[PDB]
Amino acid sequence: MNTPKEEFQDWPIVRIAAHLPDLIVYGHFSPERPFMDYFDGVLMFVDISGFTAMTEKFSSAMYMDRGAEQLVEILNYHISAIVEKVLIFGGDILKFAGDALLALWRVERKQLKNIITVVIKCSLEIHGLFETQEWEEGLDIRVKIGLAAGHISMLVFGDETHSHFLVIGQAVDDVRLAQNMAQMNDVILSPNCWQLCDRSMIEIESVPDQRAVKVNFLKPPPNFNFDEFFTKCTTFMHYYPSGEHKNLLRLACTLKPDPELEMSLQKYVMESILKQIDNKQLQGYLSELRPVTIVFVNLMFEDQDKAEEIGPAIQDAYMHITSVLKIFQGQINKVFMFDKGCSFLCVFGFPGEKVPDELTHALECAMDIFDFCSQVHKIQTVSIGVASGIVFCGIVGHTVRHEYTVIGQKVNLAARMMMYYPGIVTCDSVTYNGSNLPAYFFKELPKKVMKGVADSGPLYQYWGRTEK
Ligand SMILES: [Cl-]
Numbered sequence: 199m200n201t202p203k204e205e206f207q208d209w210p211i212v213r214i215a216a217h218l219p220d221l222i223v224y225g226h227f228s229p230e231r232p233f234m235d236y237f238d239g240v241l242m243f244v245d246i247s248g249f250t251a252m253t254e255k256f257s258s259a260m261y262m263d264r265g266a267e268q269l270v271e272i273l274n275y276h277i278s279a280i281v282e283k284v285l286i287f288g289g290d291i292l293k294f295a296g297d298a299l300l301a302l303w304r305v306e307r308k309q310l311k312n313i314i315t316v317v318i319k320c321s322l323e324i325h326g327l328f329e330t331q332e333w334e335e336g337l338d339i340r341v342k343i344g345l346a347a348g349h350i351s352m353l354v355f356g357d358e359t360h361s362h363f364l365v366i367g368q369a370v371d372d373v374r375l376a377q378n379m380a381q382m383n384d385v386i387l388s389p390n391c392w393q394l395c396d397r398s399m400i401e402i403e404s405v406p407d408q409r410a411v412k413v414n415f416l417k418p419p420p421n422f423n424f425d426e427f428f429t430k431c432t433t434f435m436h437y438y439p440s441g442e443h444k445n446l447l448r449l450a451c452t453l454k455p456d457p458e459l460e461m462s463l464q465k466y467v468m469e470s471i472l473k474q475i476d477n478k479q480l481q482g483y484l485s486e487l488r489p490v491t492i493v494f495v496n497l498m499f500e501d502q503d504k505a506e507e508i509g510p511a512i513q514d515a516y517m518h519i520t521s522v523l524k525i526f527q528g529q530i531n532k533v534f535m536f537d538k539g540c541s542f543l544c545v546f547g548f549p550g551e552k553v554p555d556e557l558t559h560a561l562e563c564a565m566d567i568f569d570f571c572s573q574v575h576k577i578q579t580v581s582i583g584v585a586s587g588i589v590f591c592g593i594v595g596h597t598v599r600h601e602y603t604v605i606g607q608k609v610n611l612a613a614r615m616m617m618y619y620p621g622i623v624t625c626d627s628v629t630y631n632g633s634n635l636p637a638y639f640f641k642e643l644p645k646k647v648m649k650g651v652a653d654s655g656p657l658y659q660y661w662g663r664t665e666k
Pocket residue numbers: 292293300363364365533534535
């Protein structure tokens with residue numbers, strides 16, 4: 199009998215799993231919300247703000263109304279190269295959030311030392327991709343890398359139709375702190391990463407006023423062979439593609455239909471992505487330069503990285519947020535930690551989600567969220583930034599690992615406003631002027647220089663309907 203080759207496997211379940219890390223795809227978690235798990239690992243934070251900063255040049259008339267298509271193409275070309283490096287070195291891309299790619303090597307505590315070596319090599323090879331790189335004006339197609347190691351907590355929250363996950367804890371805080379110290383082309387190690395690493399592998403430089411360190415070179419001992427070392431490390435990598443499947447970038451490329459698993463996984467993916475996955479919408483429909491309102495919600499906790507107390511509080515906040523956004527087809531695009539606060543990136547006006555009077559609705563939704571979350575047990579401070587304008591939306595990443603992402607000056611502005619004007623609902627001039635709500639519902643704010651934004655325009659506090 200003939201032996202014809204297996205079909206290229208591109209079942210819906212495989213297409214869904216492209217949008218999710220192995221942490222979720224193979225997690226088999228309890229249905230309970232919140233769900234908390236605890237493990238150890240090495241985190242890599244790749245700052246791709248240098249790539250995402252391209253949204254401005256692609257809004258130019260030079261791109262002839264194909265700005266979004268051109269942007270997604272060049273962003274994915276460069277980001278795919280980073281993704282392939284992380285996956286080949288055995289990492290799990292957790293999230294494309296906060297103009298960064300966050301990757302995880304989950305390993306038993308005893309193996310952290312050897313895995314840091316693998317992750318440092320990976321980090322240097324990432325930098326090596328962009329060594330002879332430019333874009334005919336600026337050479338700043340480069341990245342910054344922060345690494346951390348240690349205890350990691352995972353939170354899964356949501357309801358019966360939607361699920362979100364977050365990683366929590368000191369190593370999560372550390373990796374963001376480490377990447378923030380990095381200059382372009384740097385690999386910075388968190389204090390605990392430096393303490394846990396194989397110091398015989400690396401030459402470091404002190405970081406002024408910091409216990410974090412900078413990797414100058416990976417200079418291994420004489421009898422060292424990275425390939426044999428890597429092979430030894432794969433013993434501890436549960437999902438590294440191997441044997442029959444060593445030619446695939448992810449084990450998840452081999453996932454077979456399984457309705458109970460697909461029911462679980464689809465809850466992490468928004469419905470317009472699932473429409474595309476089901477071949478019920480054109481594959482290019484979600485790549486667009488679209489006017490939206492960003493409502494960026496930051497929740498601060500006293501117990502800044504203790505999953506047992508912050509997990510219920512986030513789930514409580516989520517249940518209210520989701521109820522508020524449902525009314526106006528608002529979506530939660532991303533949730534992630536920033537300086538130990540939990541941030542919800544909410545978007546009004548996604549494709550096919552429109553709704554007229556988007557601005558006044560966005561403000562009223564923000565105030566509703568503000569008032570409710572301020573009374574949630576263990577939430578110390580709520581801050582909300584509201585900014586409106588043209589943003590890039592689209593699926594960013596590699597074919598085998600990508601996520602729907604919103605990028606733009608107005609996303610960064612709403613994020614910076616919630617940090618620089620804590621404890622209040624703030625909005626930009628577009629939102630203030632467009633809302634047509636009476637002027638005394640707002641307070642014109644002092645101008646703050648916010649790192650990443652120049653120049654914000656007049657900013658306002660949404661005070662609300664009454665003097666209160
Ligand atoms: Cl996360």
